[PDB]
Amino acid sequence: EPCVEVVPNITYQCMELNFYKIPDNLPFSTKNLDLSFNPLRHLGSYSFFSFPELQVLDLSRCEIQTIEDGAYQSLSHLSTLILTGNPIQSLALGAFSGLSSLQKLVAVETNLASLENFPIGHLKTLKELNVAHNLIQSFKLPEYFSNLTNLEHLDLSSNKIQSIYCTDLRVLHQMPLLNLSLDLSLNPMNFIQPGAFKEIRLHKLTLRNNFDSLNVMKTCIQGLAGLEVHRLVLGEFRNEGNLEKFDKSALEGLCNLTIEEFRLAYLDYYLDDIIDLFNCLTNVSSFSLVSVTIERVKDFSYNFGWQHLELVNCKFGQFPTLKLKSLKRLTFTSNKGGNAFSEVDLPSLEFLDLSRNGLSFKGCCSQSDFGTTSLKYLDLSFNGVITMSSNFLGLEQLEHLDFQHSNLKQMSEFSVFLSLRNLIYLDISHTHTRVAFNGIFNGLSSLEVLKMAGNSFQENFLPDIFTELRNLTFLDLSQCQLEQLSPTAFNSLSSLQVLNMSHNNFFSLDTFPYKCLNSLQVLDYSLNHIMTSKKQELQHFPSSLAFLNLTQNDFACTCEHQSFLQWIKDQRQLLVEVERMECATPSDKQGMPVLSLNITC
């Protein structure tokens, strides 16, 4: 059994095993055979006959010089071929003969030279065709493309395509229904004669790092006219040579097109003002920047029609001041430069996300900070320092709120979440909070999930703060260094199902606080040090309790409180991993599971 066996009788992968022919010992009914980095200098007719039923095939770096006619013949249901890295100097016409249902064809790093002498002209149901890193000089689509329908992706990147002519794409005019996501990146191009793209329709178009100057780029963008692309992506790569210059005159003439979504990815020039640039990229419904350093820009305020905006991994000097009358969603994540926040004015905004920027607030949250009044989602997690000076005033329609790993301040000085009457989710975890006011959770009458792990309490005593939270089903109080509970704390919590109380410092296990929790199913008391109880009163838990994690905490197995261990062994239908509960205090009885020991006395 040389070939490794992944899934019984289904998936068989064996790479780098020094083979010289297709193996014969493999089962007759297997799928998705991986066979790569094995020397097969030549492929012959009816090579894969032991596999009448098969889905995925993979021949990467299997150095194949010639595929002869009739290979893959007795092979249908084959939806994928990967011929990557095989230097093919003679592909016999008629290869790929019998493949009734082939969808993906990857021919990368093959020594392709053109697309008319390529035997995929009888293929059908073929969706993706990846011919990248080849040697292709001309962007002229051959005729058989008319016969070839359902094609959705056509990646020809890193080729030698120098120029485009109007005669190219004379085909593709007789395609009423055509979705084609094209990609031409890293092709050194210096001439697009005007009128080439015209009455043409693409669904995506990517042009990254294929212009050597500013004037070349300008004239090439002029060569595009009437293109009507649904989504355009421009930019370049940090890995290669970049544009020495990027000013307001660039990117002009992009107004003769019909764009709907735009992205600019990774400029290397320190852009200095956003308008008179991006000027005729208005009425675009989606705008995005990734890795652009607009750090010295003063006038961000201008009226674009952008229904969705995204700024990811950019550097800034100041927080951009936005004034957009119709912008429903904003994503401002993982940015680097400036650390403060200033008022924005977004009258129609429903989704906000400022996460992982590390920026500070002062008087965080009010409808005068965001300018909106219908904001359903708010994420301020992983930021620097948030100072509470207003309970959320004017934000009464807000169902999701996340603060975790920020640094909250003044959270016990008034009722902070007093206006949020329609709130389902609240996450204040590892914010350096010290709960010292009964009434901190006042007004949260619809809460269902409450997470606060890593927040201490006053004198390590859990007071009666969970009143009026009658819809709560998930409650997480772990790594709050708790030592005592009030005997009536989880009252009114008739819908709680999960209750996490792991990794505190408890000594006694009391069953009175949970006496009336008719829906509890999981109770977690794991990394405590529970040795004893207050008395032998420990009654039955609520009948619903189906799991009780008690592992990993210190027990004392001696004469004293032997009754405690008797009562815990009295219920094995609720414990979790009895292998991990053992004794620790008496050095003679160490590492011995508690339920196993029979001791005297």
């Binding site: 005033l393 000085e413 007093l418 006011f437 009434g439």
Partner: protein, 140 residues
Amino acid sequence: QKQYWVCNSSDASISYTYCDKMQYPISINVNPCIELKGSKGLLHIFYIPRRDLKQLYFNLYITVNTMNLPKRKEVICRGSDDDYSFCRALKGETVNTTISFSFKGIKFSKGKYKCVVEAISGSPEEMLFCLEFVILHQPN
């Protein structure tokens, strides 16, 4: 104990009494009356201290209808060259002053807010007076 009324607004009923054994008189006025919704106005005070009003500060004990808040410490004037002119006064020297205030931006629940104010001052840091304020709040 005698009850000292101050003012009524559309949603507040401020009043106060004395804390401890000392019952030194004091005159407090606010114009216009504080609205517990965001307000702005003038606070006029007439007093005759029994100690030097030097490095004065306040201890505040607030209670929101039987839930206690943590203790607040407000430093009124500090060390040397302070913002207010009245805190160079001495024992027996009349203080007759006016201070402007303004605030907004917090929602309060109905109830019976209560506040104990302890003024501390002097060189040995002894107490000056203690008042107990009561604020009823019924929005609209």
